[PDB]
Amino acid sequence: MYTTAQLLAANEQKFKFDPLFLRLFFRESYPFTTEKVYLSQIPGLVN
Amino acid sequence: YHGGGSGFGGQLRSWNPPSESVDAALLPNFTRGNARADDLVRNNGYAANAIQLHQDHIVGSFFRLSHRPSWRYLGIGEEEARAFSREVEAAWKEFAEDDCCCIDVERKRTFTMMIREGVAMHAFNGELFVQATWDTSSSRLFRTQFRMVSPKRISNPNNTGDSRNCRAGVQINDSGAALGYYVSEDGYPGWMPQKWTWIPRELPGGRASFIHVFEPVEDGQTRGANVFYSVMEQMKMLDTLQNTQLQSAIVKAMYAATIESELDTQSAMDFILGANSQEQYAAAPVRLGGAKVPHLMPGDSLNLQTAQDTDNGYSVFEQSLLRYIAAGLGVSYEQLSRNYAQMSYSTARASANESWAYFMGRRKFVASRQASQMFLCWLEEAIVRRVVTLPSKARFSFQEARSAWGNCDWIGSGRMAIDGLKEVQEAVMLIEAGLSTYEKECAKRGDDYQEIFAQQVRETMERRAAGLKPPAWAA
């Protein structure tokens, strides 16, 4: 009824998360232009 | 405060405006706002009159250029400075008003008229976009070409949700300074695929590739808002009211008289009005004779509708609304509405001069800015081509002294006289009192003292040769 009831706080307490892997190991970005993606390597071993 | 909270017992209790930045307040419906504004200015007589007044008063028939180099700052002798000034003025007078129309790429404009185009575009869309190009054609001495592009040509590609840096087609730095634009091709016909292109604001060498001119109300306002925004609905409803009122007057006047007989329609018309005489549905055409008085029996009555006064307050109400729209647009009500009735000389002068002050301010803050930008862009090409030799004792080069060398303003149509005699009396009295200068009065009259003196000398020597009469400037 007579319930004017002004609010004063809208606390979230929603989540706790931060990647930090985006800066730890994968600093560089490379969006594709094509679809096929090729990556390779070179092994070093000799008698 | 008391009115700040809710109002005098509720009132505006349910009205809580959404406090937000200018970009948040304009970007979400910027396209439709511009569309409504251009539609109103395109199909409304009053708005067309307003924009015409803008483009005719801000600049007018002529846009004279006057350059004063910063010789004091640059450590340059005044005689060399003014020699360079007259050289560049001659170059400008042979370039800008060239009948080639080759200053602009489309070859369909001249300098003054494209200045008018720009100021009108800013007035009715809130912003101005110009670009500079270096033509590959070697036929012309000057390879610079210009083109104004509508804001609708600049938009966020794919119309996606706006990003922090790319802001509906403009790239802003960390500090928010604009550096690049997204401009798409012409959209007529729009059924062909539409392609965008990124354009830097300026060349990395310092040349101004693109020019954005607008009045930012608040910081961070990347796109200007047209002045119509505050009055669009209140003029649209006005014109709808005018149309409906005209239609109502037509329908009220088109009936006039009625007949209440019992017989069939054709017989009643024959016996009370005339008509008939058919040679061989379409009701019946009544002969337009003169002073016809019919005879009636019981059950018959001819009733001529008294209709109604057709302007029961409509004229004064639309007058008040026109006052409102004139206040909104910043122009004088008399100019907007062709209403000079019962106006005193003093009051008409007051309104005219306050409107003139507004127009001069807008001129200085829009046309002068864009003219300076394009003038500096052309001047860079001029000095590179070395058509005019910059003085050899420059303490700073043109690259850093762009503002120093490009120190120049413009004179549009002057303060046109309301009486003429009063103004010329003021001019002559101020001159004989030493309170003003030939430059000031010739600028007020739309002239320039240098070539006016040259013309005076030429006429004087012509009269001397002719042996007719020495004019009022001798020895």
Binding site: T33, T34 | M192, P193, K195
Partner: protein, 49 residues
Amino acid sequence: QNLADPAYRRRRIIMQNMRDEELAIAQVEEMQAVSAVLKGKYTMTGEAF
């Protein structure tokens, strides 16, 4: 050796599509004209028409 953006690929695809659309429209009118001044009688009909 010289690829292109799939956006440009779509652009040229649409251009070719419009071209063949125009050709298909034009041949209809040409068939109309040849039937018309070949025999005078000329009827148009087809599925769902």
